[PDB]
Amino acid sequence: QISVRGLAGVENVTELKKNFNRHLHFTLVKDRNVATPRDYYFALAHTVRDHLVGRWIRTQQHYYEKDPKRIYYLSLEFYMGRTLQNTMVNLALENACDEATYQLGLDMEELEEIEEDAGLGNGGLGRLAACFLDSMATLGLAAYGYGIRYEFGIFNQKICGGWQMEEADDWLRYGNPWEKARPEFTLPVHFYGRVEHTSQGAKWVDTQVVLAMPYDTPVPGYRNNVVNTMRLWSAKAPNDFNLGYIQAVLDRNLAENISRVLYPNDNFFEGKELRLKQEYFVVAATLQDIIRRFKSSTNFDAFPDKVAIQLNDTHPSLAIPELMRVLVDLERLDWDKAWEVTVKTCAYTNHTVLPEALERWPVHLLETLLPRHLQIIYEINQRFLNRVAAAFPGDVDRLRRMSLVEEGAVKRINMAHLCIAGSHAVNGVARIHSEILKKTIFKDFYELEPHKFQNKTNGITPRRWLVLCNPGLAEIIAERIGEEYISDLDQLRKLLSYVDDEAFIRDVAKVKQENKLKFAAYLEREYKVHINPNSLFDVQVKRIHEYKRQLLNCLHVITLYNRIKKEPNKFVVPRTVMIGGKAAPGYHMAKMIIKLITAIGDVVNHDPVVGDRLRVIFLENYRVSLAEKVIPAADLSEQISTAGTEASGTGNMKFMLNGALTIGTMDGANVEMAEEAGEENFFIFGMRVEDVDRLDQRGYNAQEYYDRIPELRQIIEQLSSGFFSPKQPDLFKDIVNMLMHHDRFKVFADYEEYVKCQERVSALYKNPREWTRMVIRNIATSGKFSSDRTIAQYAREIWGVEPSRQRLPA
């Protein structure tokens, strides 16, 4: 059908058909007379998987023979989504599988919808890890992703009576055809115990053992025949565990609970023992695998020449003291040599500056669970502070600020301080965020070791986030500039030469229109909801958090509603305002924001005076496969965090690539996006970081905005008085109280500028040719935001390896 989906050759199609029928019979044990759509999906998945395996074996054999430097990306989260379509894209099999299935009487798009997301992350951080794996493979790096195979990933969100309910995401129920269990490479992980000092060093004894069993998933690069590995660890009890008899067997669950469930918080730290066990479990199993692979090539001086460990936030920070433990206690290196090796091996990426998100573990927990690690952390601390004292003598307050050990009611270890001390590189995730790290929270560290601090602006893979989700757009681009842009996204700059081309303008607008129709119909079938596809699709999808300011969007929607009710016969540009995202289960205010959004919808969507001019929809169960559907259909991307809070954002970049315009603050990567496109091609509003600081110094008084802005005062009076909750008139009083007296994110301070900027959006939308021209200018300058760019920078500036676009033989 479309060129970028590859060739459908007669021999290839014939072979796929044969192998599909072979898997249906032999693998699935079904005949066509009782096979269901799910059986057909599995038969296709097994057929596609078979094309990966020769490449996977050969790639891994190649790394064994050439012995390149190996990159280990350690994360507690990998938000992979579905695999079937991405596999087909990266192996150039999409058109052939389409034709094969078509000839068998099946619709491949319907089969694709049966696959479960692999939802092993919360949002941005997990999804960045997934984009990064795709880019590392595409760039030919000998890279491994290491994590935990959660039995239950991020919960499925149901909305009942306008409230979030959570249900377990039993994603493995039907089986996962993409993973291969490797029970033969199972490794022991130790917990609790105590430390004994011999004449021969420290010994960690009387520990409880849990086994780490690996499951390997292939990670195909884009058309280069490279297939890298994501190795995820699952917890198993040893067979003598607890070994009346029946109870001892049932108690194996205590050990196996380590890998049972993903902690569903985004940007929030909960200091629970189970989470600490998860963190150590992933680090201890991974480090043994790394060392094994290093020894199979005494001499640890070469370790950092052969190994890079990238820490995805502080979550795997125990890698630093574990590496030291192994080197000092087991391999018998002297401390100073072990430390040199550790620092050269490890690098740390910071993803947040919000203080409630930073990991600070109580000492009493580490003392019980990981006594040898606590000893090592104290020794790191004393040696590090000795360096501080020599560089800034007499600066006692700096010694307290920089310590890894925080004093207080409860002593805690600051894991970010540990990561900085133990890493040769520390980076933020967008230019403004990296600057904030050097000026504020890590200022003291930057003064001590300025060379360590870098920036690596985030990106997204253009395989999943253009070719897979928006083939119509990919195709019209390819018609003009060829296909090379899919792995060299800077080539999109060539589209600036088309910005006055009438045929290109028409085709861009047509693709958006098709995507909107297809999304409007998806909504009707799966959720009984009726939208106007001619309306401006105004979309805010991301996790629910006060800093992301879904509430500011709510205030704008109400403002529009109230303006209509005041002048019902005046023309306004029709909108469908779509908001979606999950709230963490214990985050009360986030759950209340969901309820407010649905309650606004209950009023607006049923008011006959409004008609089809304004619709407010809460998109349920936002997840990677939903993002693939809604992002191509969006006109307006809402990126409206308070300046200084969103470290980068990555949703922002997905919308840009897919032909939405952005309304946003100068926060995170929005800054760089506006710089690349031109500020004239972006809807920027609100306080800059410097303005937020100026307000914090004076003191934020929300009452002043309420007193001066009558439209704002009306909304607050409606919320307080029960207008949006007539049966429970006080339902929203916690929201009102927060906005008026304890708003850390200054919602009211950006209200006026936001509403005015939204009127400029509406004005441009009335002129479709100029709207579309501005869209072309955004798509054309989105190249910087490829994760291939990001990864090449990590490779060159941090890991010391060269990317390659060269193919392995097929």
Give 680: exposed, middle or buried? Use CB within 10 Å, 0-12, 13-18, 19+.
exposed
The answer on whether 31 is annotated among ligand-binding residues is: yes
Choose which of 265, 513, 701, 718 interacts with ligand B0Z (CB under 6 A).
Answer: 265
Q: Are 463 and 89 in contact (CB under 8 A)?
A: yes
Contact 50, 93 (CB under 8 A): no
Q: Please tell me whether 295 is known to bind a ligand.
A: yes
CA 718/CA 724 separation, integer angstroms: 7
For residues 385 and 349, the answer to whether their CB atoms sit within 8 Å is no
Least distance to ligand PLP, CB of residue 623, Å: 5
Q: Which is nearer to ligand B0Z, 599 or 673 (CB)?
A: 673
166 binds a second copy (CB under 8 A): yes
| Distance of closest approach, residue 33 Cβ to ligand IMP, in angstroms | 5
Min separation Cβ 460 and ligand PLP, Å: 7
CB of 178 vs ligand B0Z, minimal distance in Å: 24
Binding of a second copy at residue 810 (CB under 8 A)?
no
Backbone angles phi, psi at 334, to 5 degrees: -70, 155
The CB-of-50 to a second copy minimum distance in angstroms stands at 5
> Choosing among ligand PLP, ligand B0Z, a second copy, none, which partner's interface includes residue 429 (Cβ < 5 to 8 Å by kind)?
ligand B0Z
Phi/psi for 228 (5° steps) reads -95, 175
Member of 263, 281, 537, 765 binding ligand B0Z (CB under 6 A):
263
Between 371 and 410, how does the x/- string for binding to ligand IMP read (CB under 6 A)? ----------------------------------------
Q: Which tokens hold the place of 384?
A: 């590090």
Asked if residue 292 belongs to a known ligand binding site, the reply is yes
Burial bucket for residue 415 (CB in 10 Å: 0-12, 13-18, 19+): buried
Number of residue whose CB is nearest ligand IMP: 64
Applying the rule CB under 6 A, the residues between 299 and 318 that interact with ligand B0Z are 315
Q: Rounded CA gap, 786 and 789, in Å?
A: 5
297 is in an annotated binding site: yes
3-state per-residue secondary structure call for 327-377: HHHHCCCCHHHHHHHHHHHEEEECCCCCHHHCCEEEHHHHHHHCHHHHHHH
**648: contact with ligand B0Z by CB under 6 A:** yes
**Residue 527 makes contact with ligand IMP by CB under 6 A:** no
Single residue of 3, 17, 25, 752 touching a second copy by CB under 8 A: 25
Output the DSSP codes for 766-788.
Answer: TSHHHHHHHHHHHHHT-GGGBHH
Distance from CA of residue 715 to its chain's centroid?
Answer: 34
Size of the chain, expressed as the number of residues it contains: 810
Residues 647-706 that bind ligand PLP (CB under 6 A): 649-652, 654
Catalytic residue ranges:
351, 542-543, 548, 650, 654
Name residue, tokens 């996204």: 489
Query: Least distance (Å) from ligand B0Z to the CB of residue 681?
Result: 22
State the binding partner of 623 from ligand B0Z, ligand IMP, ligand PLP, none, CB within 5 to 8 A by kind. Answer: ligand PLP
d(CA 749, CA 284): 47
Which residues inside 576-605 make contact with ligand B0Z, applying CB under 6 A?
none
> Phi-psi region for residue 200, left (φ > 0), alpha (ψ -120 to 50) or beta?
alpha
Buried-exposed string 317-347: b where 16+ CB fall within 10 A, e elsewhere = bbbbbbbbbbbbbeeebeeeebbbbbbbbbb
**Residue 795 gets which letter from DSSP?**
I
For a second copy, the binding residues in 218-247 under the rule CB under 8 A are 236-237, 239-241, 243-246
Residues that bind ligand B0Z (CB under 6 A): 122, 124-125, 128, 263, 265-268, 315, 351-352, 357, 429, 458, 646-650, 668
Enumerate the known binding-site residues for AMP: 31, 64, 292-297
Enumerate the known binding-site residues: 31, 64, 292-297
Residues that bind a second copy (CB under 8 A): 25-26, 29-31, 36, 38, 50, 53-54, 56-57, 61, 152, 155-156, 165-168, 170, 173-175, 180-181, 183-184, 236-237, 239-241, 243-246, 249-250, 252-253, 257, 260-261, 263-264, 272, 274, 585-586
